[PDB]
Write a protein that binds this ligand. Structure first.
Ligand code: CDL
Ligand code: 3PE
Ligand code: 3PE
Ligand code: 3PE
Ligand code: PLC
Ligand code: PLC
Ligand code: LMT
Ligand code: LMT
Lengths: 179, 67, 89, 168, 92, 69, 469
């Protein structure tokens, strides 16, 4: 893998969240009911700026940190980032069990989002349609979407491990009397 | 088979007539000629689908023959 | 390109941030169509192409019919209510 | 006046399993090559629509009691039914021209008609009042227009040479 | 004013960026403002007729695009039939 | 003596015919998925009669020197 | 046939009284039936997916569009039957459901615009047809001008559709500015990967999609569907959706868009959650249509989506018509007429319908469990084919969102059934008035289709494999 620059990405994160919070505050000011002016965009906004900035900083910082600590790029980093973002969103409600639930559940949700590829889109060169499918032809290495009538036994033993029934030689041939 | 398809489509037509009579809060034998009319209508639809399907299969077989 | 984008954007903002009238909404729609037609005709001239002018004259016709229908709908609303107020469409 | 094409066309294209006659047949040909089955379809629709509204009045009547619909509605019904039937007949004959349905009779008739036209030194598919460019535009407007019979009617009246056949 | 200004900037800049095919985003605005160099108008002698813009509009609208004219006819029919349905009250 | 079950051979043969029909439907589904999403002709996809994609434009001031291959 | 119908009905309605409009609707309903019977053999033109370009290159005709047109004729037949045949021959039902003089003409013109949208190959035709649809459907929302709510909805719908049409025109003219063309056939592999073109194309897609309620722009159309008459809602909630989504499915415009994915997820979540606290029937059904529109948005990202879209739109049309017809039939047993225009508004007015009409509740149950996607019904096979396509094309998070939305929507779908199978005091014991024969048969036929159409899935696939592949 290639390391992430935490502080730079998180500074970009904070500026983006700040701009988004300003836009949401302006939208709230214009959509609202009561008497309002150019003063109220930050007085009467329900912590929108702090929501956006905190979520952005927390998510990007935690993601890049976990990617640099774990030394990997996978969906567990999105699980941690969701845990942190949920902790921020749940510290607003000044209650412990709601904070814990927010953390755990948005961690699980963003971790699912990362497990599935960290994308609302598709890869479109890893999809089943664009990838080699069906039965594999002549002793070739079975790819992900390919099908096989009969698999290699060394592969089974490595993927699964010896023990609990699964052995490098069948039992009957391995116990056959040398006659 | 054709006869099976026509019988089943006529059964669907009888079901429509029955459910119509019941939505109307009438007895199930209110006007028994409607069963005959529904039968022949739905059987005509089924015959149409049967013929379309048969022509489709004939096309995909003519392709093999010409291949 | 510039005049049309400017008229379009300002008409859209004067439609969105209108707390005054319904007539301003009608006007902003018509001026939006105007801006599109002007961009369209400038490109028609630069490419030396007729499809743009055809689309433009079609927009003229369609916008006329739009105005007629919209101001019939307003008249029905006024048939029932008798006053078209600052708010409530 | 020259009756020679400006753009290239397909030669003997296959719209179905049967051979091609004309890819954009004239109204005259589509009506003259009709079969008695087509006229039967016309009469069938012409009779079915008014009978249809009387059947509807029998099933669920407008007022409480059954009353045969006015002759007003029966007249308009007959007219609309004849129109629907002419549409279906024109479509059947045009699909026979395209090679989508069985067209052996129409094939031999077209062969004989074109041979007689060549014998009389006449242009195949006729001579037009329009320039070649307008013949092209007309063909491109009318070609395969029967596919949109559900929406709009459009028919060939222009005598263009862009029927999808060999040059002679 | 905040949303008005934000939307003014965003919408104008996007409307000027949308017309160019360049990949980098900032350059897409910079090409829109690249109105510096004049167009040369040379003269040809191939157009023999007196065809103007209205003549060509008619030609294409009545030959190449006859369908949209005969659909605009139904649009104008709506323009007549709708307002009567909405404004008039039919007695019986 | 009341037990009159279908023999093993006929059972195996009937099951084999069923599996052969199922594999035939499989191969048909694969063939149809492959015949779709396969590039078709301009005549089959757009225009069977006017099969020339090349545009011939206006005609009122046609300049010699405007066509190009 | 439609233009013949329009030009005939304009004259025949001008020269006829208001006492004749119901019979006029009956006549044109039989006309559409005869057309769909006699002229439907044209499917043979599209054998092996032969495609035709008509009116220069302004229209496109293939199996997809022929099917959508047959479907729109079927829908118009049902909607015209609801106006041409009285449910009950009482003074109440001659006060609630009366056709206005121009309504049938506007319906046929809107159908014309719908079909010229799906058949469009050039953007000038698309724009003319979009406007012919939208003007006519403004006037359809407004024709019941004695309703305050309907006039208000007319004007809101005018302005919002106008703005979204401005967006469509901007997209079209920008496409022209870039490529000097109005035709999407002008695009290929090379032009897509050589020009960055996604802003224009997604602007077009969203201008078309927000006209059918795609979030976050759903509240206005849901208010319009609430505030309109029931027999107008049944039309204006279905036919525009079919038209625009069919155009966007035939035109492969958003094959792997991130914005469309995001907005489709948002449509699913909103259409599932927002319908949970709705106490009114039409808003509930509007949010149902919203989430189904999301399911159909998902297959704008596929490039091979004909079977799934056609199955789902057909089954959704049948279910939509059936549920609105059941709500129309339930008015005889509700104990409180709310309006002259929306006689039934709230779901709790359906309380105890099983004790007055049990088989109507059987129909409701079938339709509700098809909406939920319960096998062996038709919505299950719809959802299955959609899932098949989106998982074959690599949308794995959207699939889980789809399952969660399918589950959350079941609650407000089951609200109806639950209150319908509850007990009620003051049940019905006798009634000498009988509901119509024709409308009863139509509803029963739709229910039987939902219930027993899975028998023919093999045959439908075998026909599709010849006419669409
Ligand atoms: C009924 C017609 C019966 C008939 O056979 O008359 C044949 C008659 C020609 O008689 P002929 O002397 O033997 O000439 C033979 C060739 O046609 C002569 O070939 P030609 O090259 O000399 O043709 C010259 C010109 C000669 O034509 C004329 O100038 C005659 C003028 C007739 C005016 C109308 C009456 O023909 C045209 O260019 C006609 C163009 C047709 C335009 C397409 C019309 C089809 C659509 C109709 C439905 C409406 C559209 C709704 C769609 C809405 C869209 C959403 O042609 C017509 O009647 C045209 C009628 C078109 C009405 C529609
Ligand atoms: C200024 C400097 C700029 C610097 C450059 C960088 C800036 C980045 C800016 C990013 C965009 C920020 C936009 C913020 C959203 C708009 C503001 C908003 O409030 O949206 C909601 C809006 C009003 O809501 P409100 O009136 O406040 O009342 C709420 C009570 N429920 O009401 C609305 O309906 C409008 C909704 C708009 C939504 C847009 C589409 C969002 C897509 C949703 C994503 C969902 C995907 C997640 C899927 C997970 C599935 C489990
Ligand atoms: C033949 C179809 C059955 C039929 O005709 O229905 C008749 C009905 C009772 O008829 P019955 O009572 O004997 O005569 C009434 C005298 N006026 O009997 C019924 O009510 C039939 C209702 C059941 C239909 C269900 C669909 C059957 C599908 C079969 C395939
Ligand atoms: C209709 C009412 C009348 C008013 C009209 C107003 C003018 C119209 C403006 C344009 C048209 C509206 C477009 C609607 C928004 C949705 C556009 C869209 O979704 O297209 C995005 C598309 C990429 O998305 P996609 O194709 O789905 O994903 C694959 C990615 N490779 O394509 C793209 O990649 C987009 C390219 C990115 C650049 C966007 C430009 C924004 C620049 C703003 C900078 C402002 C400066 C900083 C902040 C200032 C605030 C103080
Ligand atoms: C084409 C349809 C053919 C007829 C059909 O297939 O449907 C048959 C049904 C018959 O219904 P019914 O209850 O027996 O009518 C009872 C009428 N009496 C009481 C006057 C006898 O027609 C319909 O109700 C509506 C068909 C739409
Ligand atoms: C067509 C009127 C639609 C109105 C609604 C009624 C549904 C009719 C379904 C027939 C479709 C067909 O048979 O066709 C199959 C089509 C393409 O075939 P096609 O080109 O259209 O040829 C058909 C030629 N016809 C018109 C002469 C018949 O494939 C599809 O994806 C259809 C998906 C629809 C699934 C819904 C199944 C409903 C159960 C049917 C119980 C009888
Ligand atoms: C509400 C209950 C939720 C519980 C249900 C959980 C089901 C979620 C689906 C889990 C399976 C997803 O499958 C996952 O597998 C492979 C690894 O095997 C991931 O692995 C792939 O990730 C993507 C993202 O970098 C790249 O293509 C990468 O090269 C790798 O191939 C995929 O990103 C994902 O598709
Ligand atoms: C709840 C159960 C249902 C969940 C819904 C989703 C079901 C589908 C599961 C997701 C499939 C993910 O599959 C995706 O990742 C695998 C790796 O694991 C990749 O498979 C590829 O991995 C690469 C390594 O990166 C290797 O070279 C391997 O030989 C293969 O080519 C493919 O890019 C793709 O097939």
């Amino acid at each position: 893998f290639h390391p992430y620059n935490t502080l730079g990405l998180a500074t970009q994160s904070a500026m983006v969240g700040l701009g988004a919070g300003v836009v949401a505050a302006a939208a709230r000011n214009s959509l609202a009911t009561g008497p309002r002016n150019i003063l109220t965009t930050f007085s009467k906004s329900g912590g929108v700026v702090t929501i956006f900035t905190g979520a952005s900083i927390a998510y990007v910082f935690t993601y890049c940190s976990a990617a640099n600590l774990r030394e990997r790029k996978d969906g567990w980093n999105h699980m941690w980032a969701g845990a942190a973002t949920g902790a921020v969103l749940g510290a607003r409600t000044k209650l412990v069990p709601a904070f814990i639930g927010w953390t755990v559940l948005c961690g699980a949700a963003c971790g699912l989002f990362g497990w599935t590829g960290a994308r609302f889109n598709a890869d479109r060169k890893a999809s089943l349609e664009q990838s080699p499918k069906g039965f594999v032809q002549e002793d070739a290495h079975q790819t992900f979407w390919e099908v096989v009538h009969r698999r290699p036994l060394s592969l089974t033993v490595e993927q699964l491990g010896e023990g609990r029934g699964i052995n490098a030689v069948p039992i009957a041939t391995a116990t056959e009397a040398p006659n | 088979a054709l006869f099976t398809s026509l019988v089943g489509a006529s059964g669907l037509g009888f079901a429509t007539k029955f459910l119509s009579n019941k939505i109307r809060l009438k007895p199930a034998g209110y006007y028994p000629l409607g069963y005959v009319f529904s039968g022949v209508a739905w059987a005509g639809l089924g015959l149409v689908l049967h013929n379309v399907h048969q022509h489709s299969l004939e096309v995909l077989e003519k392709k093999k023959t010409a291949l | 390109m510039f005049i049309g984008t400017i008229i379009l954007v300002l008409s859209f903002l004067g439609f969105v941030f209108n707390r005054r009238n319904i007539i301003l909404a009608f006007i902003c729609l018509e001026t939006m169509l105007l801006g599109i037609n002007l961009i369209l005709l400038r490109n028609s001239v630069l490419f030396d192409d007729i499809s743009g002018s055809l689309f433009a004259i079609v927009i003229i016709i369609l916008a006329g019919v739009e105005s007629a229908i919209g101001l019939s709908l307003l008249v029905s609303y006024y048939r029932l209510r008798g006053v078209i107020n600052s708010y409530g469409i | 006046s020259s009756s020679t094409p400006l753009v290239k066309t397909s030669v003997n294209y296959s719209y179905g399993d049967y051979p091609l006659i004309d890819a954009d047949p004239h109204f005259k040909r589509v009506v003259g090559y009709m079969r008695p089955s087509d006229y039967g379809v016309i009469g069938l629709a012409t009779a079915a629509l008014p009978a249809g509204i009387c059947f509807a009045e029998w099933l669920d009547p407008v007022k409480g009691k059954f009353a045969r619909p006015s002759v007003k509605f029966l007249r308009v019904a007959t007219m609309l039914g004849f129109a629907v039937g002419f549409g279906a007949a024109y479509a059947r004959s045009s699909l026979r021209f395209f090679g989508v349905t069985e067209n052996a009779r129409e094939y031999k008739k077209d062969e004989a008609q074109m041979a007689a036209r060549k014998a009389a030194g006449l242009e195949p598919y006729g001579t037009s009042s329009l320039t070649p460019e307008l013949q092209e535009i007309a063909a491109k407007n009318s070609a395969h227009s029967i596919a949109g019979l559900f929406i709009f009617p459009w028919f060939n009246f222009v005598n263009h040479p862009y029927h999808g056949r060999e040059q002679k | 004013l905040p949303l008005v200004l934000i939307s003014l900037i965003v919408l104008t800049i996007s409307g000027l960026m949308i017309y160019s095919n360049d990949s980098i985003l900032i350059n897409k605005l910079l090409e829109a403002f690249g109105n510096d160099y004049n167009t040369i108008i040379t003269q040809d002698w191939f157009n023999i007729e007196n065809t103007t813009l209205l003549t060509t509009i008619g030609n294409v609208l009545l030959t190449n695009n006859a369908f949209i004219l005969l659909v605009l006819a139904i649009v104008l029919l709506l323009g007549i039939i709708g307002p009567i349905s909405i404004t008039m009250k039919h007695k019986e | 003596t009341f037990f009159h079950p279908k023999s093993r051979e006929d059972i195996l043969n009937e099951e084999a015919k069923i599996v052969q029909a199922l594999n035939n439907q499989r191969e048909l589904t694969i063939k149809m998925h492959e015949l779709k999403r396969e590039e078709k002709d301009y005549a089959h996809s757009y225009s069977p009669l006017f099969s020339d994609p090349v545009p011939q434009g206006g005609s009122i001031g046609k300049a010699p020197g405007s066509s190009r291959e | 046939m439609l233009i013949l119908a329009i030009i005939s009905l304009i004259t025949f309605v001008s020269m006829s009284k208001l006492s004749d409009n119901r019979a006029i609707i009956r006549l044109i309903n039989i006309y559409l039936i005869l057309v769909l019977v006699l002229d439907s053999f044209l499917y043979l033109l599209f054998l092996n997916n032969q495609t035709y370009t008509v009116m220069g290159e302004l229209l496109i005709f293939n199996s997809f569009t022929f099917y959508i047109d047959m479907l729109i004729y079927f829908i118009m037949i049902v909607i015209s039957s609801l106006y041409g045949y009285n449910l009950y021959n009482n003074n109440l039902y001659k006060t609630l459901f009366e056709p206005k003089k121009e309504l049938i003409i506007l319906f046929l013109i809107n159908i014309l615009g719908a079909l010229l949208i799906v058949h469009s190959n050039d953007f000038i035709t698309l724009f003319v047809a979009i406007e012919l649809q939208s003007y006519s459907i403004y006037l359809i929302t407004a024709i019941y001008n004695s309703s305050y709510k309907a006039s208000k909805a007319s004007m809101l719908y005018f302005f919002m559709g106008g703005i979204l049409s401005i967006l469509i025109a901007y997209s079209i003219n920008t496409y022209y500015s870039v490529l000097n063309s109005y035709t999407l056939h002008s695009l290929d592999s090379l032009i897509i990967n050589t020009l960055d073109l996604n802003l224009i194309l997604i602007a077009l897609s969203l201008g078309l999609l927000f006209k059918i309620g795609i979030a976050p722009l759903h509240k206005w159309l849901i208010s319009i569907y609430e505030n309109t008459p029931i027999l107008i809602t049944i039309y204006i909630s279905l036919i525009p959706k079919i038209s625009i989504l069919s155009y966007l499915v035939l035109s492969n415009i958003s094959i792997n868009s991130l914005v469309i994915s995001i907005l489709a997820i948002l449509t699913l979540l909103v259409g599932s959650v927002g319908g949970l606290l709705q106490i009114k029937i039409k808003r509930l059904l509007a949010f149902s249509g919203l989430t189904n529109a999301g399911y159909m948005m998902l297959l704008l990202l596929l490039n091979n989506n004909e079977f799934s879209y056609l199955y789902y739109i057909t089954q959704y049309s049948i279910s939509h018509l059936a549920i609105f017809m059941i709500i129309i039939f339930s008015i005889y047993y509700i104990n409180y007429i709310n309006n002259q225009y929306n006689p039934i508004i709230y779901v709790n007015q359906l309380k105890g319908l099983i004790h007055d009409n049990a088989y109507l509740v059987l129909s409701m149950a079938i339709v509700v469990f098809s909406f939920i996607g319960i096998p062996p019904l038709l919505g299950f096979f719809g959802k299955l084919n959609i899932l098949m396509s989106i998982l074959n094309n690599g949308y794995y998070f959207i699939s889980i969102v789809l399952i969660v939305a399918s589950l959350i929507s079941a609650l407000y779908y089951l609200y109806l059934l639950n209150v319908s199978i509850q007990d009620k005091n003051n049940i019905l014991i006798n009634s000498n008035e009988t509901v119509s024969s024709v409308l009863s048969y139509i509803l029963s036929s739709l229910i039987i289709l939902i219930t027993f159409g899975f028998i023919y899935n093999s045959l439908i696939i075998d026909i599709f494999n010849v006419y669409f592949n």
